[PDB]
Paper text:
The rate-determining step in this pathway is set by eIF2B, a heterodecameric guanine nucleotide exchange enzyme whose activity is determined by its conformational state and its assembly from subcomplexes. eIF2B promotes GTP loading of the trimeric GTPase eIF2 (composed of α-, β- and γ-subunits), enabling eIF2 to assemble with methionyl-initiator tRNA to form the rate-limiting translation initiation ternary complex (TC). Using hydrogen–deuterium exchange–mass spectrometry and cryo-electron microscopy, we identified a central α-helix whose orientation allosterically coordinates eIF2B conformation and assembly. Through comprehensive characterization of eIF2B remodeling events via HDX–MS, cryo-EM, biochemistry and cellular signaling experiments, we discovered that eIF2B allosteric coordination is mediated by a switch that is triggered both in A-state → I-state and tetramer → decamer transitions. This conformational switch is orchestrated by a highly conserved helix that is located at the core of the eIF2B decamer and facilitates the hinging motion that converts eIF2B from the A-state to the I-state.
The decameric complex can disassemble into two stable tetramers composed of subunits β, γ, δ and ε (herein referred to as ‘eIF2B tetramer’ or ‘eIF2Bβγδε’) and one dimer composed of two α-subunits (herein referred to as ‘eIF2Bα2’ or ‘α2 dimer’). eIF2B tetramers have reduced activity relative to fully assembled eIF2B decamers (later referred to as ‘eIF2B(αβγδε)2’ or ‘eIF2B decamers’). To explore conformational change and side chain interactions associated with the assembly reaction in the switch-helix, we determined a cryo-EM structure of the eIF2Bβγδε tetramer to a resolution of 3.1 Å. Overall, the architecture of the tetramer closely resembles that of the eIF2Bβγδε tetramer in the context of the eIF2B(αβγδε)2 decamer structure. A close look at the switch-helix elements revealed that the side chains in the eIF2Bβγδε tetramer adopt the I-state conformation, with δR517 forming a salt bridge with δE445 and the δF443 rotamer in the ‘up’ position, consistent with the increased protection seen in HDX–MS. Switch-helix conformation correlates with eIF2B activity; side chain arrangements are identical in low-activity tetramers and I-state decamers and switch to the opposite state in high-activity A-state decamers. Shown is one representative experiment from a total of three replicates. d, The eIF2B switch-helix is in the I-state orientation in the eIF2Bβγδε tetramer (1).
Author numbering:
A (entry chain A): 41 to 279, 285 to 462
B (entry chain I): 1 to 10, 17 to 61, 72 to 136, 155 to 237, 297 to 444
C (entry chain E): 167 to 517
D (entry chain D): 8 to 98, 125 to 351
Write the structure that this text describes.
């Protein structure tokens, strides 16, 4: 059967809500490229021949962005179908609707709209199909993981997880998240059933990719209280069975906060998601052409950086990004059309399209959204966010936890300097 | 001396004869750990049995005034020991080369190294390499299901859990462990109390384990393990002591009517006419006098048959006499019991 | 103690050298309480065979620490002289240690120095004073030739590290990493490029240490050095042994990195103490070397191992070289505790 | 024509994602087949607009993967042979199809037989009881050694590549025929250079001056061979030769993900470290002694004279 996937282009949580009032999370650029573009490229490369897009919040912008992409073309292979509705507001509400409309007929892949990965799912496909054929369709979902050290910056505390898995058949017997927990509790139900190869694993990174079967849609329809995949796995492991697949040589991660954003951007810039590198141009557009150099230097067309400026390490330059003199840029991604002043340093920052930086500014570990503006003699401490063309006053330093936007109750006051 | 060997010789209906002296494979039970200690270095060994045991190295026997825990017994013999002690159980029959756990004790400078075998109630945490000990708890000890500290998982993300492992009570202890036991007298029964203490304190103190899945590693503690160990002895005794023939001792009045395959017969146990001993260990001074069919059975010593009996899957204590043609199947006959010609059920008749 | 057995077919050009396996050990046919070999020596050999201690300096430190235990526990037999009997008795221990792992040049120098010191034990001196003096002499030798001799080398290499320089180091050398760590905190702001090669992959050991020290780091494999060398301004390498003719014996990848850097006109400097200078002279990499376990060559590239079963093929042999020498013309500066003598006139100064 | 567009796009994405098939000769033959197919399934009147169309296709093709020069070389060959067909007829528009098709078929048929001709020179070069080194996996060199060993006995020492141990496969393949192979790491090259009589390795792309674009570590091997004055022999098919000059900027070597060199499970140290994994390296022609091809032994300086016969100078820049 032709492989198909279900793509959810909406995260039903307020974890990106100094920003998401303007554009959805799936449209946020990771490295000059939208988040949903990476997921679509991964789905196309992994062998999926048809995808369904379920967008509820700001569906018009998502549809407009998708229709002009390379994935909507007569020559494309992974045909996309955009389904927009304001009724559903949860993953369960979408999985119980995909069953009602009978869109899925075989083993499909359930993946969010902000997953950055290059994992080949063919081996997982074969393992899941063999398990279902041999066990009279007992397994219902194979969740893709990735072995990594717990101290890696990619593993955040919010998305941390620990499992108790039988090593013989790599089937999940317990699933819980470690959020503010110093000790972990494991029941004795799994030990009694099989005492051969029970193993507790804490070195697995939640890739958030889970290939499923229409039985999962039927179960989600049956249980109205189910809203999230975590709820489904908790309800299934208490009362069918769930297996996993462990990846060791391929990259995979889903962004959910600024920490995940920074980690994924750093990994992508350092070519950890090859061949999905900025210079590869996996999306066929003329405004994202780059050129790779030593120490991972990416330069767009017509940059024209000023004299005396040094690009130290892992910097992406957009198309038409004017750079001043005596600059110092390292570990930062700058979008197209930006104007950079003089004697200005950038360390682990992220500048989107349209930002202007005056001379003398010092920005470290910050994020600037579209059309933002920074005046002279302004110092930005780490973990500061400027959104939607907001401006700051000259000779003013922002504290560490200083998020500034034009919305009164969310963050600090408007752009009026 | 690099090591100091200690054996702790301090479940019913067969304890009239002392438990360390239980005849297993026509040999004393205490002979097996002693032989395991022997023929690999170990010219000396300390033994802490009671008076009833009257037990090659010159074994040092220390009588015990009253029953006490094994940890208390170890604390009692502190002046005798002067280095790292190797603690062994009184009733334990293995074929493993002792160097497997001694290498873990030596190379890693481990504070404790112990041996168990896979089964053929207790949860043991095993590192991915299969040697380091991480978790150890008994099911009845903790009311909560299973608690694992996050700190011990941060450094060891992968932990393998087993439930069927059987403890061999083969412990390699460092010198300061005995001092700690002396200054902390509340600790008793090292197997149940001290061992978990040294596991939770690592997260320096290190503990390693050598999991076995090929050997026997029998630890007789109940009647069920007693019968199983005897039937596996004949293969072991062939390699351990090839000098003594497995068939019979030289001073024997056996009938010479064959009917013996893979069966050990003790000294001067006269056999009558056309008997049948199939995979059974006959004791010492057993007067067999007729066509008796004995299959997979144990007779301690001085057990006499009279006229054409059937013996199947049973244990008989010493000084027991059967009468005429009784048929025996899956039974236990006490020491001195006189059972006439009848069919005996599973019931374990005792004196 | 029997001689250690071989493992697998050996290379035709490396027939003379011995090649042992890591999984098997020489302690299988040994008494559990060691009597032929001192228990400290047994522990040292077991650690050496498993690769627990592999540093050139750490191996010598551990060997001398074990020799301290051997000296302390030694007792003079009647009508015997300590100065000669100790030397005679120490030979079997080192013979046993040789089987576990081939000895390094620094080990040979330490052995020669200790033998010379033991030979000079006076007849009038009794056991206690002679043993205490020997232990104090060993400790003083360690202090003044191991930890104190590194301070001078680091302070000398301080002048050769200026602001803005990039240094390409190879392997896991304690002295080389210590130089960078001690020079980074004195004000110099440099960047280090860490280069290593499989199967040991020990460059991560110094890479992580440099990262934890705040020094910017770069990691890449040996074949990528030629690509990264144009930007490299200096090369720092550790020397396992200084030869009589000036050749620098070091890790297998050292002699090739200098050759590649010469074509790029990048200066190359090696730093080592003067106690690693061995009197033997030899210009090739074949007559004197050590063969490691060939099983480390195989890797799990993809889902299958290409060299999973290499012993089946009768014409395929795995070669795991360890050391090789570099010509004195390749390296233009040798840093020692006595100064900055050129590599050409190394023996004249070191004599 | 829709199937033609689907085929060209599919080949473009195949090049972009992962080079398939692995063998270079099979990929060149596939490029020839697809170029012939797009030749015979298009509408045109003159040669100029068809040349422009093929130029557009080739420009996209090498923009997908600049590191692969075989497709560009073969497109240049197609352009050159089309120019020959036009010149031999102009010195008059419809009859070009048959000439182009027959000439392309002849080129493909000759392309099938570029292995036996290269291997046939193994008897003259390789001798008995001589140590020969090869780095990485190269089908041409493997066939060379295997056919040379059919009548001679010698020792081959194969050095595995650093990121992908592809030398193990070559050593296993050679040892299956009884050649007495040997496997080491990349660091033993200078140590074993002492007794190595000759070095015979393959390459990926031959440049204008005779340089190489082989796998990583080739430059070090050539330098070590030159230091000990051991001759180095390069065997490569004709189509691998490219008119590209050695280097104009960076990215001459393709960079695969750093996961190959340093694994993800390292921990927090990955954030503060930069790890690079080159696949190819530059080899100056001064380190090359001889070249083996369908013609025979060619000096490294004698590499340019074939450019005029193979490629038209106007097509060098593409």
């Amino acid at each position: 059967p032709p492989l198909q996937a279900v793509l959810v282009a909406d995260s039903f949580d307020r974890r990106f809500f100094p920003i998401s009032k303007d554009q959805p999370r799936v449209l946020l650029p990771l490295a000059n490229v939208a988040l949903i573009d990476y997921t679509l490229e991964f789905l196309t490369a992994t062998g999926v021949q048809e995808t369904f897009v379920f967008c509820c919040w700001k569906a018009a912008q998502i549809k407009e962005h998708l229709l002009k992409s390379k994935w909507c073309r007569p020559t494309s292979l992974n045909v996309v179908r955009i389904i927009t509705s304001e009724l559903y507001r949860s993953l369960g509400d979408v999985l119980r609707d995909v069953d009602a409309k009978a869109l899925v007929r075989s083993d499909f892949l359930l993946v969010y709209g902000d997953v950055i990965s290059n994992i080949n799912i063919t081996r997982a496909l074969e393992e899941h199909r063999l398990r279902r054929k041999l066990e009279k369709n007992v397994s219902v979902m194979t969740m893709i993981f990735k072995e990594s050290s717990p101290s890696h910056p990619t593993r955040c505390h919010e998305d941390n997880v620990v499992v108790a898995v039988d090593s013989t058949t790599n089937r999940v017997l317990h699933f819980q998240k470690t959020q503010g927990l110093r000790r972990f509790a494991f029941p004795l139900s799994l030990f009694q059933g099989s005492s051969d190869g029970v193993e507790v694993r804490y070195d697995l990174l939640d890739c958030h990719i889970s290939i499923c079967s229409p039985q999962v849609a039927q179960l989600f329809t049956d249980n109205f209280d189910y809203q999230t995949r975590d709820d489904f796995v908790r309800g299934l492991l208490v009362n069918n069975q769930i297996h996993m697949h462990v990846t060791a040589k391929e990259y995979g991660a889903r962004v959910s906060n600024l920490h995940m954003y920074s980690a994924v951007c750093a990994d992508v810039i350092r070519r950890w998601v090859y061949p999905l590198t900025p210079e590869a141009n996996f999306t066929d557009s003329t405004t994202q052409s780059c050129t790779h150099s030593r120490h991972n230097i990416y330069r767009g067309p017509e940059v024209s950086l000023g004299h005396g400026s040094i690009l130290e390490e892992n910097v992406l330059l957009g198309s038409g990004t004017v750079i001043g003199s005596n600059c110092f840029i390292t570990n930062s991604v700058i979008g197209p059309g930006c104007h950079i002043g003089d004697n200005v340093v950038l360390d682990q920052t992220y500048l989107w399209q349209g930002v202007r930086v005056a001379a003398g500014a010092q920005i470290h570990q910050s994020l600037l959204c579209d059309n933002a503006e920074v005046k002279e003699r302004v110092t930005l401490k780490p973990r500061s966010v400027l959104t939607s063309q907001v401006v700051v006053g000259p000779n003013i330093t922002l504290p560490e936890g200083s998020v500034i936007s034009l919305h009164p109750p969310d963050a600090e006051e408007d752009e009026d300097d | 001396m690099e090591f100091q060997a200690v054996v702790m010789a301090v479940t019913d209906l067969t304890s009239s004869i002392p438990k360390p002296l239980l005849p297993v494979g026509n040999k004393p039970l205490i002979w097996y750990p002693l032989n395991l200690l022997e023929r690999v270095g170990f010219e000396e060994v300390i033994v802490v049995t009671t008076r009833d045991v009257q037990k090659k190295p010159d074994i040092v026997c220390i009588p015990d005034d009253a029953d006490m825990g094994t940890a208390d017994s170890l604390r009692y013999i502190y002046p005798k020991l002067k280095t790292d002690v190797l603690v062994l159980s009184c009733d334990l029959i293995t074929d493993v080369a002792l160097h497997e756990v001694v290498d873990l004790f030596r190379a890693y400078d481990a504070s404790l190294a112990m041996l168990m075998r896979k089964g053929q109630r207790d949860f043991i945490g095993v590192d991915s390499t299969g040697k380091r000990l991480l978790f150890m708890a008994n099911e009845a000890d903790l009311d909560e299901e299973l608690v694992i500290k996050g700190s011990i998982l941060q450094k060891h993300p992968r932990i393998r859990f087993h439930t069927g492992l059987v403890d061999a009570h083969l412990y390699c202890l460092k010198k300061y462990i005995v001092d700690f036991l002396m200054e902390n007298g509340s600790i008793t029964s090292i197997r149940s109390e001290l061992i978990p203490y040294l596991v939770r304190k690592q997260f320096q103190v290190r503990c390693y384990v050598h999991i076995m899945k090929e050997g026997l590693c029998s630890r007789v503690s109940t009647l069920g393990l007693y019968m199983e160990a005897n039937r596996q002895v004949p293969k072991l005794l062939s390699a351990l002591c090839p000098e003594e023939p497995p068939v019979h001792s030289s001073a024997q009045i056996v009938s010479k009517h064959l009917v013996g395959v893979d069966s050990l017969i003790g000294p001067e146990t006269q056999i009558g006419e056309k008997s049948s001993i199939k995979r059974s260990v006959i004791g010492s001074s057993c007067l067999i006098k007729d066509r008796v069919t004995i299959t997979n059975c144990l007779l301690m010593n001085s057990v006499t048959v009279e006229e054409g009996s059937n013996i199947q899957g049973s244990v008989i204590c010493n000084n027991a006499v059967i009468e005429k043609g009784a048929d025996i199947k899956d039974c236990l006959i006490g020491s001195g019991q006189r059972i006439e010609a009848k069919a005996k059920r599973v019931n374990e008749v005792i004196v | 103690v029997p001689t250690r057995k071989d493992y697998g077919s050996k290379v035709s050009l490396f027939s003379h050298l011995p090649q042992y396996s890591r999984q098997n050990s020489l302690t299988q046919f040994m008494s559990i309480p060691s009597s032929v070999i001192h228990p400290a020596m047994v522990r040292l050999g077991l650690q050496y065979s498993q690769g627990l201690v592999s540093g050139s300096n750490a191996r010598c430190i551990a060997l001398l620490r074990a020799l301290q235990q051997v000296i302390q526990d030694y007792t003079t037999p009647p009508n015997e002289e300590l100065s000669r009997d100790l030397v005679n008795k120490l030979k079997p221990y080192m013979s046993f240690l040789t089987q576990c792992r081939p000895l390094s040049a620094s080990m040979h120098n330490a052995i020669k120095f200790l033998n010379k010191e033991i030979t000079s034990v006076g007849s009038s001196k009794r056991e206690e004073e002679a043993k205490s003096e020997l232990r104090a002499a060993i400790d003083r030798y360690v202090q003044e030739k191991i930890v104190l001799a590194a301070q001078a080398i680091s302070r000398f290499a301080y002048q050769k590290i200026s602001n803005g320089d990039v240094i390409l180091v190879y392997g896991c050398s304690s002295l080389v990493s210590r130089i960078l760590q001690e020079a980074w905190t004195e004000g110099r702001r440099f960047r280090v490029v860490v280069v290593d090669s499989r199967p040991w992959l020990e460059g991560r050991h110094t890479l992580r240490s440099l990262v934890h020290a705040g020094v910017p780091a770069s990691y890449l494999l040996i074949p990528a050095a030629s690509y990264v060398l144009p930007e490299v301004s200096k090369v720092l390498l550790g020397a396992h042994a200084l030869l009589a003719n000036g050749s620098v014996m070091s890790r297998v990848g050292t002699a090739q990195l200098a050759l590649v850097a010469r074509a790029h006109n990048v200066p190359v400097l090696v730093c080592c103490e003067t106690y690693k200078f061995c009197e033997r002279v030899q210009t090739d990499a074949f007559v004197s070397n050590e063969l490691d376990d060939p099983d480390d060559l195989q890797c799990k590239r993809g889902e299958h191992v290409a060299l999973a079963n290499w012993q089946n093929h009768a014409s395929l042999r795995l070669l795991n070289l360890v050391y090789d020498v570099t010509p004195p013309e390749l390296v233009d500066l040798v840093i020692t505790e006595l100064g900055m003598i050129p590599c050409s006139s190394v023996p004249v100064v070191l004599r | 024509g829709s199937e033609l567009s689907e085929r060209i796009e599919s080949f473009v994405e195949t090049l972009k994602r992962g080079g398939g098939p692995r063998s270079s000769e099979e990929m060149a033959r596939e490029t020839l087949g697809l170029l012939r197919q797009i030749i015979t399934d298009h509408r045109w009147s003159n040669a100029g607009e068809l040349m422009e169309l093929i130029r557009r296709e080739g420009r996209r093709m090498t923009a997908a993967q600049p590191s692969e020069t075989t497709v560009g070389n073969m497109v240049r060959r197609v352009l050159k042979i089309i120019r020959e067909e036009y010149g031999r007829l102009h010195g008059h528009y419809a009859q070009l199809q048959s000439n182009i098709i027959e000439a392309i078929n002849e080129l493909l048929v000759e392309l099938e037989g570029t292995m036996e001709n290269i291997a046939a020179q193994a008897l003259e070069h390789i001798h008995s009881n001589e140590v020969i080194m090869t780095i990485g996996f190269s089908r041409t060199v493997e066939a060379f050694l295997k056919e040379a060993a059919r009548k001679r006995k010698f020792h081959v020492i194969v050095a595995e590549c650093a990121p992908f141990c592809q030398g193990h496969e070559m050593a296993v393949n050679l040892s299956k025929a009884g050649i007495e192979t040997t496997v080491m790491t990349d660091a033993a090259i200078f140590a074993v250079m002492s007794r190595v009589n000759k070095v015979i390795i393959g390459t990926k792309t031959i440049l204008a001056n005779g340089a190489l674009r082989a796998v990583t570590g080739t430059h070090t091997l050539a330098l070590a061979a030159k230091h000990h004055s051991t001759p180095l022999i390069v065997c490569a098919p004709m189509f691998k030769l490219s008119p590209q000059f050695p280097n104009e900027e960076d990215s001459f070597h393709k960079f695969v993900a750093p996961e190959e060199v340093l694994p993800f499970t390292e921990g927090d140290i990955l954030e503060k470290v930069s790890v690079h994994c080159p696949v190819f390296d530059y080899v100056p022609p001064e380190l090359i002694t001889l070249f083996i091809s369908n013609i025979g032994g060619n000096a490294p300086s004698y590499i340019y004279r074939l450019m005029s016969e193979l490629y038209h100078p106007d097509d060098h820049v593409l």
